[PDB]
Ligand binder design. Structure first.
Ligand SMILES: [Mg+2]
Ligand SMILES: [Mg+2]
Ligand SMILES: [Mg+2]
Ligand SMILES: [Mg+2]
Ligand SMILES: [Mg+2]
Ligand SMILES: [Mg+2]
Ligand SMILES: [Mg+2]
Ligand SMILES: [Mg+2]
Ligand SMILES: [Mg+2]
Ligand SMILES: [Mg+2]
Ligand SMILES: [Mg+2]
Ligand SMILES: [Mg+2]
Ligand SMILES: [Mg+2]
Ligand SMILES: [Mg+2]
Ligand SMILES: [Mg+2]
Ligand SMILES: [Mg+2]
Ligand SMILES: [Mg+2]
Ligand SMILES: [Mg+2]
Ligand SMILES: [Mg+2]
Ligand SMILES: [Mg+2]
Ligand SMILES: [Mg+2]
Ligand SMILES: [Mg+2]
Ligand SMILES: [Mg+2]
Ligand SMILES: [Mg+2]
Ligand SMILES: [Mg+2]
Ligand SMILES: [Mg+2]
Ligand SMILES: [Mg+2]
Ligand SMILES: [Mg+2]
Ligand SMILES: [Mg+2]
Ligand SMILES: [Mg+2]
Ligand SMILES: [Mg+2]
Ligand SMILES: [Mg+2]
Ligand SMILES: [Mg+2]
Ligand SMILES: [Mg+2]
Ligand SMILES: [Mg+2]
Ligand SMILES: [Mg+2]
Ligand SMILES: [Mg+2]
Ligand SMILES: [Mg+2]
Ligand SMILES: [Mg+2]
Ligand SMILES: [Mg+2]
Ligand SMILES: [Mg+2]
Ligand SMILES: [Mg+2]
Ligand SMILES: [Mg+2]
Ligand SMILES: [Mg+2]
Ligand SMILES: [Mg+2]
Ligand SMILES: [Mg+2]
Ligand SMILES: [Mg+2]
Ligand SMILES: [Mg+2]
Ligand SMILES: [Mg+2]
Ligand SMILES: [Mg+2]
Ligand SMILES: [Mg+2]
Ligand SMILES: [Mg+2]
Ligand SMILES: [Mg+2]
Ligand SMILES: [Mg+2]
Ligand SMILES: [Mg+2]
Ligand SMILES: [Mg+2]
Ligand SMILES: [Mg+2]
Ligand SMILES: [Mg+2]
Ligand SMILES: [Mg+2]
Ligand SMILES: [Mg+2]
Ligand SMILES: [Mg+2]
Ligand SMILES: [Mg+2]
Ligand SMILES: [Mg+2]
Ligand SMILES: [Mg+2]
Ligand SMILES: [Mg+2]
Ligand SMILES: [Mg+2]
Ligand SMILES: [Mg+2]
Ligand SMILES: [Mg+2]
Ligand SMILES: [Mg+2]
Ligand SMILES: [Mg+2]
Ligand SMILES: [Mg+2]
Ligand SMILES: [Mg+2]
Ligand SMILES: [Mg+2]
Ligand SMILES: [Mg+2]
Ligand SMILES: [Mg+2]
Ligand SMILES: [Mg+2]
Ligand SMILES: [Mg+2]
Ligand SMILES: [Mg+2]
Ligand SMILES: [Mg+2]
Ligand SMILES: [Mg+2]
Ligand SMILES: [Mg+2]
Ligand SMILES: [Mg+2]
Ligand SMILES: [Mg+2]
Ligand SMILES: [Mg+2]
Ligand SMILES: [Mg+2]
Ligand SMILES: [Mg+2]
Ligand SMILES: [Mg+2]
Ligand SMILES: [Mg+2]
Ligand SMILES: [Mg+2]
Ligand SMILES: [Mg+2]
Ligand SMILES: [Mg+2]
Ligand SMILES: [Mg+2]
Ligand SMILES: [Mg+2]
Ligand SMILES: [Mg+2]
Ligand SMILES: [Mg+2]
Ligand SMILES: [Mg+2]
Ligand SMILES: [Mg+2]
Ligand SMILES: [Mg+2]
Ligand SMILES: [Mg+2]
Ligand SMILES: [Mg+2]
Ligand SMILES: [Mg+2]
Ligand SMILES: [Mg+2]
Ligand SMILES: [Mg+2]
Ligand SMILES: [Mg+2]
Ligand SMILES: [Mg+2]
Ligand SMILES: [Mg+2]
Ligand SMILES: [Mg+2]
Ligand SMILES: [Mg+2]
Ligand SMILES: [Mg+2]
Ligand SMILES: [Mg+2]
Ligand SMILES: [Mg+2]
Ligand SMILES: [Mg+2]
Ligand SMILES: [Mg+2]
Ligand SMILES: [Mg+2]
Ligand SMILES: [Mg+2]
Ligand SMILES: [Mg+2]
Ligand SMILES: [Mg+2]
Ligand SMILES: [Mg+2]
Ligand SMILES: [Mg+2]
Ligand SMILES: [Mg+2]
Ligand SMILES: [Mg+2]
Ligand SMILES: [Mg+2]
Ligand SMILES: [Mg+2]
Ligand SMILES: [Mg+2]
Ligand SMILES: [Mg+2]
Ligand SMILES: [Mg+2]
Ligand SMILES: [Mg+2]
Ligand SMILES: [Mg+2]
Ligand SMILES: [Mg+2]
Ligand SMILES: [Mg+2]
Ligand SMILES: [Mg+2]
Ligand SMILES: [Mg+2]
Ligand SMILES: [Mg+2]
Ligand SMILES: [Mg+2]
Ligand SMILES: [Mg+2]
Ligand SMILES: [Mg+2]
Ligand SMILES: [Mg+2]
Ligand SMILES: [Mg+2]
Ligand SMILES: [Mg+2]
Ligand SMILES: [Mg+2]
Ligand SMILES: [Mg+2]
Ligand SMILES: [Mg+2]
Ligand SMILES: [Mg+2]
Ligand SMILES: [Mg+2]
Ligand SMILES: [Mg+2]
Ligand SMILES: [Mg+2]
Ligand SMILES: [Mg+2]
Ligand SMILES: [Mg+2]
Ligand SMILES: [Mg+2]
Ligand SMILES: [Mg+2]
Ligand SMILES: [Mg+2]
Ligand SMILES: [Mg+2]
Ligand SMILES: [Mg+2]
Ligand SMILES: [Mg+2]
Ligand SMILES: [Mg+2]
Ligand SMILES: [Mg+2]
Ligand SMILES: [Mg+2]
Ligand SMILES: [Mg+2]
Ligand SMILES: [Mg+2]
Ligand SMILES: [Mg+2]
Ligand SMILES: [Mg+2]
Ligand SMILES: [Mg+2]
Ligand SMILES: [Mg+2]
Ligand SMILES: [Mg+2]
Ligand SMILES: [Mg+2]
Ligand SMILES: [Mg+2]
Ligand SMILES: [Mg+2]
Ligand SMILES: [Mg+2]
Ligand SMILES: [Mg+2]
Ligand SMILES: [Mg+2]
Ligand SMILES: [Mg+2]
Ligand SMILES: [Mg+2]
Ligand SMILES: [Mg+2]
Ligand SMILES: [Mg+2]
Ligand SMILES: [Mg+2]
Ligand SMILES: [Mg+2]
Ligand SMILES: [Mg+2]
Ligand SMILES: [Mg+2]
Ligand SMILES: [Mg+2]
Ligand SMILES: [Mg+2]
Ligand SMILES: [Mg+2]
Ligand SMILES: [Mg+2]
Ligand SMILES: [Mg+2]
Ligand SMILES: [Mg+2]
Ligand SMILES: [Mg+2]
Ligand SMILES: [Mg+2]
Ligand SMILES: [Mg+2]
Ligand SMILES: [Mg+2]
Ligand SMILES: [Mg+2]
Ligand SMILES: [Mg+2]
Ligand SMILES: [Mg+2]
Ligand SMILES: [Mg+2]
Ligand SMILES: [Mg+2]
Ligand SMILES: [Mg+2]
Ligand SMILES: [Mg+2]
Ligand SMILES: [Mg+2]
Ligand SMILES: [Mg+2]
Ligand SMILES: [Mg+2]
Ligand SMILES: [Mg+2]
Ligand SMILES: [Mg+2]
Ligand SMILES: [Mg+2]
Ligand SMILES: [Mg+2]
Ligand SMILES: [Mg+2]
Ligand SMILES: [Mg+2]
Ligand SMILES: [Mg+2]
Ligand SMILES: [Mg+2]
Ligand SMILES: [Mg+2]
Ligand SMILES: [Mg+2]
Ligand SMILES: [Mg+2]
Ligand SMILES: [Mg+2]
Ligand SMILES: [Mg+2]
Ligand SMILES: [Mg+2]
Ligand SMILES: [Mg+2]
Ligand SMILES: [Mg+2]
Ligand SMILES: [Mg+2]
Ligand SMILES: [Mg+2]
Ligand SMILES: [Mg+2]
Ligand SMILES: [Mg+2]
Ligand SMILES: [Mg+2]
Ligand SMILES: [Mg+2]
Ligand SMILES: [Mg+2]
Ligand SMILES: [Mg+2]
Ligand SMILES: [Mg+2]
Ligand SMILES: [Mg+2]
Ligand SMILES: [Mg+2]
Ligand SMILES: [Mg+2]
Ligand SMILES: [Mg+2]
Ligand SMILES: [Mg+2]
Ligand SMILES: [Mg+2]
Ligand SMILES: [Mg+2]
Ligand SMILES: [Mg+2]
Ligand SMILES: [Mg+2]
Ligand SMILES: [Mg+2]
Ligand SMILES: [Mg+2]
Ligand SMILES: [Mg+2]
Ligand SMILES: [Mg+2]
Ligand SMILES: [Mg+2]
Ligand SMILES: [Mg+2]
Ligand SMILES: [Mg+2]
Ligand SMILES: [Mg+2]
Ligand SMILES: [Mg+2]
Ligand SMILES: [Mg+2]
Ligand SMILES: [Mg+2]
Ligand SMILES: [Mg+2]
Ligand SMILES: [Mg+2]
Ligand SMILES: [Mg+2]
Ligand SMILES: [Mg+2]
Ligand SMILES: [Mg+2]
Ligand SMILES: [Mg+2]
Ligand SMILES: [Mg+2]
Ligand SMILES: [Mg+2]
Ligand SMILES: [Mg+2]
Ligand SMILES: [Mg+2]
Lengths: 121, 129
RNA sequence: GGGAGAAGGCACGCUGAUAUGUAGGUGAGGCGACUUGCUCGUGGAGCUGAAAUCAGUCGAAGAUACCAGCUGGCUGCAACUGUUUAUUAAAAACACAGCACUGUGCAAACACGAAAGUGGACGUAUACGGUGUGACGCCUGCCCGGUGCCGGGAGGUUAAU
RNA sequence: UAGCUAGUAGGUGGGGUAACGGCUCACCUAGGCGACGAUCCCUAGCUGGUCUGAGAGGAUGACCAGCCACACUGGAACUGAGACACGGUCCAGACUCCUACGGGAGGCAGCAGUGGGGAAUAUUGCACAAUGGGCGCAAGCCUGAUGCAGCCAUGCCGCGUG
RNA sequence: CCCGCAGAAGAAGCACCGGCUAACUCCGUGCCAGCAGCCGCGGUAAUACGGAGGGUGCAAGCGUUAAUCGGAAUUACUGGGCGUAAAGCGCACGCAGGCGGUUUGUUAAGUCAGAUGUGAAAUCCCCGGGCUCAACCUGGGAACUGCAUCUGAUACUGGCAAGCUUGAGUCUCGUAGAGGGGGGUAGAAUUCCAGGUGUAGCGGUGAAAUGCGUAGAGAUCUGGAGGAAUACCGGUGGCGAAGGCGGCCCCCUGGACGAAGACUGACGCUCAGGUGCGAAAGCGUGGGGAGCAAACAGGAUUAGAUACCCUGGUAGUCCACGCCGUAAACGAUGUCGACUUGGAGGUUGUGCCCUUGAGGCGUGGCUUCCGGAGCUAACGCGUUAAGUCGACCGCCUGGGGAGUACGGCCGCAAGGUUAAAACUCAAAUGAAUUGACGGGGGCCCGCACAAGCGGUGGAGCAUGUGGUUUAAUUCGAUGCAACGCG
RNA sequence: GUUCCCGGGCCUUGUACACACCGCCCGUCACACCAUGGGAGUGGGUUGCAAAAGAAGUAGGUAGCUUAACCUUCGGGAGGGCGCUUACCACUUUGUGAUUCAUGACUGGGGUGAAGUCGUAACAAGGUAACCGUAGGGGAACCUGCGGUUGGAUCACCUCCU
RNA sequence: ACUAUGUUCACG
């Protein structure tokens, strides 16, 4: 406030940081993948959530959630990563794209198959 | 410490109307009389005087139609901290043209309606609803 | 304050020129004058003379000889200059400024001395002696059972007489 | 990031520039910029616009058009009306290159295309028929400029699928 | 582009269906598997998971991801705030800067009006036109919010000359005050020191003990030494910018307020950097040290007690000279000015009548409390505003990370000051409301306690549970409110 | 007989409780993961200063070697070209800083994680009111001193007064 | 006088 104060120091616009550091406004990104493993979520949930560390191509080292029931990911295996938090595993802030590269489609799925990368019956 | 005298006039008018007060004394000036006469001429104030030789005291006489006051709202626009000069076509119209904006134009102080027809702009002193 | 000559660089000879030797130093024959002078203040003839810049020029090399720092980084110990085993040890040892405890009221404590007397001191507690520690910065914790020291005086034991 | 700055800031005179100018010299003066942000650091081609918004604004600058900049990296000039010259020249460099070992090449940020990078983005097509461009009296020759074609639901829009 | 056959023939997916948000059932699964844009779904009757049917929404596309704006008045110029939610620097002085009472001039910088040039074309926009239609192309128009110059206008703002008196300041005269700085001295008390009296305790506590005492303490009296603090007066009293400031007396000294004049003639208000002051605790050096008292020791308490309680007790607390620069430095409320109903006090002035008897009306300063309009999320504030406006400054932008790190600046140090980011959460927060609770308060009541009386718990047996055993020892009840219970 | 123990009733008050005190809740310690500062250092990027360097070219100077037109006394003048040379200067070299990004034994805190350990600091007078500053102490919340704030509770137990 | 604690998610 005070118009003279604003002339002397203008309104600093709140530069809101991005949720997902995949960098340079990229839709998806390749990941070599290391340590595929299970993890427990926060309070009201309780499960064994399937998740992997992902050595990204640009240099970053991120965890990514593995959606669907069952997966082919292990040790290495090159996968594709898209954005999206899980909101349960604190730290996990990406999703593996099912269908793309070494990550295969979910077995025996019918409804909602673009998500989970499965072809027609 | 008394930076804007014109705003102080318009508060005395606003605060006189809130208190249901008959008359409103204050130190006079050239620009005070010009504004006070425009408010009278259209009909927010009911008469005024400028009694005094050495130390003049301009007192107004506020209008009341019902129990409610006549001056609904009155505010300073072109304050000394931020002067607001509008052009001919960019002149405002208060309350969609049933209130007035006192505007100091090159041909004396006048209403915004008169400034449009006269064909000129100026410093918009105050909106009066 | 330093470190610091940190590190590391560049320029250096000779010959002309600027300048028939310069700024500078320097002061004479003069001339005011002021008086009696080993005079004041001009005055600047000669001698003297850097340091530069510019242009040449020779050599492989110009601070050419003698003379005359090796430098930087990490780290222990001791703050420092100093002292020390004359004649195998120079140091981290001693000392040191600074710090604490302690004694000492002046015929001071203490020391040398059978003593007289001397130093301490022709000083007097902001002084003096002893002990430890050892600039400076941050600090210096618990134990008084044992050994010492200090204070207390009832009681026990206790010499000479 | 609080001080930067010695051709630095101005003068006189000489040279040089198509043109004026510390453009560049010699001397002279001691400035100049700086809290209305110099200097230093990081980032960035700029605009018409584009998207968004009630508007103010916010974000952005692919395609079309104007300006600038650059041409393997670092320099220099020559030629010319125009360049300190994408497909000139000369050095130097890194990397590919062929040789008879003496020495030579070479420059896709023109068009196709390859490897590599990437989440990701196309044919080693046809044609000067038009529209400009180049030279030439012209005819014409030249032209990956342009006009077509390929590819891709990448969009906007039409008709399907009775 | 036009006809010519041919035959529905070759030509439909994929999101979603718990709320936001258009659309529901059934099986499978059982906090698993999984979903998730936000809230959240799944623990054996899932509308949210997986499948199935059914629906809904788009359809040669659909969804997911990323990216920008929007909604976000969540950086607020249009258009937000700062008593308690995030947010008034601890308080002053003050240069640059922002703002400035009032009347004449006078310019024309701002401002306003007009005019001319330009603001490339495309794009956008509107009326047309052309492709079967559309997208697309396209004619004209408007626009290009601008910038420049040129001529005017003088209200306002500025510059510039005089003013002028309301602001602001000076002088005269008094009044009040723990304003300050320096120096004296007074009495009460506490402690220790010396002595007299005197005979077992004193001291302390919830209860004890450590501690002091037959060496004669405690108590009592006399004389003395110290140091620190000033009973009563003393108040919702006063003074100070804030921090803060109390015995009494002098020395120097700053301000405040009133009275009626005279003078100056806007000299003013704010203030980034900057400087000054700034409780307590610390820190340095030199003193001082009664009481008190971090640390520390012992004794209790306790499961433990590095605490609370007790007995001791050093730095410190005190003075001189420097440093520190912070506090819930608080009215949690920046400074200055104007304006807008009241009431009850306190405090300090000053005028007019009769002091005609501790009177009475008035008008000023400072101040405590309760309330009106109005404001506020509410609580509340309310002429000393958080009301109504103006000037300027400081600050805020979800909670954690963090007033932390790094770097600067300052500091002897302690540390102060300036001040991030990654990461992480969907909250954190304020006021008020209804309950419930409290080792909060009041008032009652009940075999609740007291006042009694007889029992259980000891024994043996009956019965019921737990357990253990068993082929089975069916099943249920399992704090009061299950256990001679169904 | 009503002070206390237990339960209940009404009123008032504080509350960080609403599964409503059998409530909430703080910090160490233990484990896992993530980001993050310090750290003997190590490995780059950029870049300041101080020099050395000097290829090509351009210009200035020219003892040397030349040489078509102009002038000519038919001798040669002029002028030019090469070579040399000086200046300007690129590559490159040396030293030393600055800054910035990686990385590093170990280490300091920080965040997150359904049912770990130790206590119970806070919210009620939270059982010693809480909190702010500061100093000392302590396994941990914290405790203690000094000053400050109310964002503390009860102020029918005293007893005696207006 | 002193006098500690109440595993997790839920049901409203
Ligand atoms: Mg879990
Ligand atoms: Mg206009
Ligand atoms: Mg030095
Ligand atoms: Mg060294
Ligand atoms: Mg020196
Ligand atoms: Mg040297
Ligand atoms: Mg040297
Ligand atoms: Mg050295
Ligand atoms: Mg020599
Ligand atoms: Mg010479
Ligand atoms: Mg001479
Ligand atoms: Mg001379
Ligand atoms: Mg001389
Ligand atoms: Mg003579
Ligand atoms: Mg001479
Ligand atoms: Mg002379
Ligand atoms: Mg001579
Ligand atoms: Mg030379
Ligand atoms: Mg030479
Ligand atoms: Mg020789
Ligand atoms: Mg030579
Ligand atoms: Mg040499
Ligand atoms: Mg030598
Ligand atoms: Mg030497
Ligand atoms: Mg070391
Ligand atoms: Mg060693
Ligand atoms: Mg070692
Ligand atoms: Mg050492
Ligand atoms: Mg030594
Ligand atoms: Mg030492
Ligand atoms: Mg020696
Ligand atoms: Mg000796
Ligand atoms: Mg010796
Ligand atoms: Mg020896
Ligand atoms: Mg010997
Ligand atoms: Mg030695
Ligand atoms: Mg020796
Ligand atoms: Mg020493
Ligand atoms: Mg003798
Ligand atoms: Mg003797
Ligand atoms: Mg003697
Ligand atoms: Mg003597
Ligand atoms: Mg002594
Ligand atoms: Mg020694
Ligand atoms: Mg020693
Ligand atoms: Mg020391
Ligand atoms: Mg010290
Ligand atoms: Mg003893
Ligand atoms: Mg003794
Ligand atoms: Mg003794
Ligand atoms: Mg003794
Ligand atoms: Mg030309
Ligand atoms: Mg120029
Ligand atoms: Mg639009
Ligand atoms: Mg719109
Ligand atoms: Mg909007
Ligand atoms: Mg831009
Ligand atoms: Mg492009
Ligand atoms: Mg194209
Ligand atoms: Mg093009
Ligand atoms: Mg141009
Ligand atoms: Mg140009
Ligand atoms: Mg170039
Ligand atoms: Mg170019
Ligand atoms: Mg190229
Ligand atoms: Mg080229
Ligand atoms: Mg080139
Ligand atoms: Mg080049
Ligand atoms: Mg030609
Ligand atoms: Mg040219
Ligand atoms: Mg070319
Ligand atoms: Mg090419
Ligand atoms: Mg080559
Ligand atoms: Mg190409
Ligand atoms: Mg390719
Ligand atoms: Mg042909
Ligand atoms: Mg053509
Ligand atoms: Mg031609
Ligand atoms: Mg022709
Ligand atoms: Mg013809
Ligand atoms: Mg042709
Ligand atoms: Mg061709
Ligand atoms: Mg083309
Ligand atoms: Mg399509
Ligand atoms: Mg298509
Ligand atoms: Mg596709
Ligand atoms: Mg047809
Ligand atoms: Mg047919
Ligand atoms: Mg048919
Ligand atoms: Mg048929
Ligand atoms: Mg079909
Ligand atoms: Mg399970
Ligand atoms: Mg169920
Ligand atoms: Mg079901
Ligand atoms: Mg479903
Ligand atoms: Mg369906
Ligand atoms: Mg799409
Ligand atoms: Mg947005
Ligand atoms: Mg906005
Ligand atoms: Mg605003
Ligand atoms: Mg807000
Ligand atoms: Mg708060
Ligand atoms: Mg707050
Ligand atoms: Mg404040
Ligand atoms: Mg304040
Ligand atoms: Mg501030
Ligand atoms: Mg000022
Ligand atoms: Mg002004
Ligand atoms: Mg004015
Ligand atoms: Mg005025
Ligand atoms: Mg005029
Ligand atoms: Mg003007
Ligand atoms: Mg203008
Ligand atoms: Mg105009
Ligand atoms: Mg246009
Ligand atoms: Mg149209
Ligand atoms: Mg048509
Ligand atoms: Mg049409
Ligand atoms: Mg269009
Ligand atoms: Mg058109
Ligand atoms: Mg047009
Ligand atoms: Mg037009
Ligand atoms: Mg006029
Ligand atoms: Mg005028
Ligand atoms: Mg004027
Ligand atoms: Mg006075
Ligand atoms: Mg007075
Ligand atoms: Mg006083
Ligand atoms: Mg007084
Ligand atoms: Mg007093
Ligand atoms: Mg006083
Ligand atoms: Mg005083
Ligand atoms: Mg006084
Ligand atoms: Mg005592
Ligand atoms: Mg006695
Ligand atoms: Mg006794
Ligand atoms: Mg006694
Ligand atoms: Mg006694
Ligand atoms: Mg006495
Ligand atoms: Mg004493
Ligand atoms: Mg005394
Ligand atoms: Mg005292
Ligand atoms: Mg005051
Ligand atoms: Mg006051
Ligand atoms: Mg006081
Ligand atoms: Mg006193
Ligand atoms: Mg005074
Ligand atoms: Mg005064
Ligand atoms: Mg005064
Ligand atoms: Mg007065
Ligand atoms: Mg007057
Ligand atoms: Mg006057
Ligand atoms: Mg300030
Ligand atoms: Mg100070
Ligand atoms: Mg003080
Ligand atoms: Mg103090
Ligand atoms: Mg200390
Ligand atoms: Mg002290
Ligand atoms: Mg010291
Ligand atoms: Mg000291
Ligand atoms: Mg002391
Ligand atoms: Mg003492
Ligand atoms: Mg004991
Ligand atoms: Mg204890
Ligand atoms: Mg206990
Ligand atoms: Mg136990
Ligand atoms: Mg114990
Ligand atoms: Mg005590
Ligand atoms: Mg003491
Ligand atoms: Mg004193
Ligand atoms: Mg301060
Ligand atoms: Mg200070
Ligand atoms: Mg503070
Ligand atoms: Mg205070
Ligand atoms: Mg207060
Ligand atoms: Mg505050
Ligand atoms: Mg205020
Ligand atoms: Mg003030
Ligand atoms: Mg002020
Ligand atoms: Mg006011
Ligand atoms: Mg006021
Ligand atoms: Mg009143
Ligand atoms: Mg009163
Ligand atoms: Mg009130
Ligand atoms: Mg009033
Ligand atoms: Mg009032
Ligand atoms: Mg009042
Ligand atoms: Mg007032
Ligand atoms: Mg206010
Ligand atoms: Mg408010
Ligand atoms: Mg302020
Ligand atoms: Mg700020
Ligand atoms: Mg912020
Ligand atoms: Mg944050
Ligand atoms: Mg703090
Ligand atoms: Mg800090
Ligand atoms: Mg640091
Ligand atoms: Mg410093
Ligand atoms: Mg200092
Ligand atoms: Mg320092
Ligand atoms: Mg210290
Ligand atoms: Mg300390
Ligand atoms: Mg609350
Ligand atoms: Mg509250
Ligand atoms: Mg109760
Ligand atoms: Mg009983
Ligand atoms: Mg009985
Ligand atoms: Mg019995
Ligand atoms: Mg019986
Ligand atoms: Mg029995
Ligand atoms: Mg029993
Ligand atoms: Mg029995
Ligand atoms: Mg049974
Ligand atoms: Mg049984
Ligand atoms: Mg059963
Ligand atoms: Mg019952
Ligand atoms: Mg039951
Ligand atoms: Mg029964
Ligand atoms: Mg009860
Ligand atoms: Mg009842
Ligand atoms: Mg009630
Ligand atoms: Mg409370
Ligand atoms: Mg709750
Ligand atoms: Mg509890
Ligand atoms: Mg802790
Ligand atoms: Mg923590
Ligand atoms: Mg780290
Ligand atoms: Mg690190
Ligand atoms: Mg490092
Ligand atoms: Mg050179
Ligand atoms: Mg060369
Ligand atoms: Mg020839
Ligand atoms: Mg010839
Ligand atoms: Mg010839
Ligand atoms: Mg020649
Ligand atoms: Mg480690
Ligand atoms: Mg380790
Ligand atoms: Mg356990
Ligand atoms: Mg335990
Ligand atoms: Mg507690
Ligand atoms: Mg506590
Ligand atoms: Mg309590
Ligand atoms: Mg307790
Ligand atoms: Mg407590
Ligand atoms: Mg409390
Ligand atoms: Mg504290
Ligand atoms: Mg502290
Ligand atoms: Mg502490
Ligand atoms: Mg400690
Ligand atoms: Mg321990
Ligand atoms: Mg303690
Ligand atoms: Mg306290
Ligand atoms: Mg526990």
């Amino acid at each position: 406030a005070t118009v003279n104060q604003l002339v002397r120091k203008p309104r600093a616009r709140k530069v809101a940081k991005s949720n997902v550091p995949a960098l340079e406004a990229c839709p998806q990104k390749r990941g070599v993948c290391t340590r595929v493993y299970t993890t427990t979520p926060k309070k009201p949930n309780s499960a064994l959530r399937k998740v992997c560390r992902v050595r990204l191509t640009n240099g970053f080292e991120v965890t990514s959630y593995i959606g669907g029931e069952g997966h082919n990911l292990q040790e290495h295996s090159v996968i594709l990563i898209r954005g999206g938090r899980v909101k349960d595993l604190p730290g996990v802030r990406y999703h593996t794209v099912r269908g793309a590269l070494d990550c295969s489609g979910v077995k025996d799925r019918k409804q909602a198959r673009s998500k989970y990368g499965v072809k027609r019956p | 410490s008394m930076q804007d005298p014109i705003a102080d006039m318009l508060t005395r008018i606003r605060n006189g109307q809130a208190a249901n007060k008959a008359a409103v004394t204050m130190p006079s000036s050239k620009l005070k009389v010009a504004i006070a006469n425009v408010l009278k001429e259209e009909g927010f104030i009911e008469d005024f005087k400028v009694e005094g030789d050495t130390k003049p005291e301009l007192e107004l006489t506020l209008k009341y139609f019902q129990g409610k006051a006549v001056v609904e709202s009155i505010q300073r626009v072109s304050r000394p901290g931020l002067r607001i000069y509008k052009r001919k076509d960019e002149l405002p119209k208060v309350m969609a043209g049933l209130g007035i904006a006192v505007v100091s134009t090159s041909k004396g102080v006048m209403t915004d309606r008169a400034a449009r027809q006269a064909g000129l702009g100026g410093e918009i002193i105050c909106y009066v609803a």
